[PDB]
Amino acid sequence: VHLTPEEKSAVTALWGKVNVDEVGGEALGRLLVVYPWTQRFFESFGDLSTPDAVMGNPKVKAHGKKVLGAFSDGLAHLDNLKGTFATLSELHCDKLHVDPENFRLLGNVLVCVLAHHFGKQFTPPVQAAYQKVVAGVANALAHKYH
C-alpha cells in the first residue's frame, strides 16, 4: 500500500499517542450510532437502542479495543496488509457474514475519531495518510471474500 515514509512516519508518530483502548470503543460505538444498520452484527451485545446505551455498552468498548488492537498490529505491517489480515478476512467472510462495506464505514468513523481526539494535529496530510491506511485495511479485510 503506497505510503511514502513521510506518510509512514506520520501515521506512526500519531498512532503512538493513541489510547488504543479508548479510541477503539469510541470508533465502534460511533460506528453503531452513526450508521445504525451496522448494529445488525451485534444483537448479542445487549442494549444498542440509544447513543448513551451504545456508548457505555461494555461489550462495545471491549469489542472496539479488540478491533483497534488488530488494526494497531496492521500498522506494523503496512507492507503486508493482505497477509496480516488473511485469517481475519476469512473470519469476517465465512463465519461472521460481515459485508465489507462496514470496514469502510468504520475506517471513516475512525478518521473522525482521530480528528476529534487529536484536533489540529490531525492535519490534512496526516488525514490523507490515514485514509490510505484505512482503505488499505478495508481492502485487506475484504480480500478473502467469495
Partner: protein, 141 residues
C-alpha cells in the same frame, strides 16, 4: 424524481414483464450473488446454489414488491412502508447493495426485453430502481 415520461416507461417495461417478474427477480438475485459475492453475506441462511427454490422464492417476493411499487409509483413511500420498516429495522442491508441489485435487475431486463429496453427506458428504469432503493433505505436513521 420520476417524471411522467418515466412512469410511462416503467409501467410499459414492467407491463411486458408480467408473469415472468418472479423468474426475472430470481435471475437478478443470482446475477447479483455471482457478480457481487459480498451480497451473499446477507444470505447466510440461504442455500445459494444454482436453481435453488429459496432464491426463486425470494426472487418472486422481490418481483412482487417491485410490481407493487410500479402500481403505486406515485405513492411508493406508503405502498412500500412495510418493506422500508423491515429493511431499516430488521434486515439492515447496507445501502450500497441496493445499487448492486438494481444493476442486476437492469441487466436481467435487458437480457430479456431486448426490444423494450430502449436508452430512454433504461434511464427511467434506472431512476425507478434508485427511487425504490431510496424508499427502502428511507428509515435507516
Amino acid at each position: 424524481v420520476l417524471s411522467p415520461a418515466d412512469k410511462t416507461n416503467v409501467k410499459a417495461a414492467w407491463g411486458k414483464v408480467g408473469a415472468h417478474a418472479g423468474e426475472y427477480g430470481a435471475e437478478a438475485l443470482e446475477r447479483m450473488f455471482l457478480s457481487f459475492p459480498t451480497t451473499k453475506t446477507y444470505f447466510p441462511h440461504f442455500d445459494l446454489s444454482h436453481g435453488s427454490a429459496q432464491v426463486k422464492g425470494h426472487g418472486k417476493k422481490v418481483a412482487d414488491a417491485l410490481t407493487n411499487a410500479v402500481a403505486h409509483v406515485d405513492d411508493m413511500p406508503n405502498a412500500l412502508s412495510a418493506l422500508s420498516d423491515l429493511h431499516a429495522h430488521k434486515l439492515r442491508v447496507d445501502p450500497v447493495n441496493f445499487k448492486l441489485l438494481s444493476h442486476c435487475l437492469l441487466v436481467t431486463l435487458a437480457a430479456h426485453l431486448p426490444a423494450e429496453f430502449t436508452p430512454a427506458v433504461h434511464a427511467s428504469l434506472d431512476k425507478f430502481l434508485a427511487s425504490v432503493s431510496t424508499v427502502l433505505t428511507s428509515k435507516y436513521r
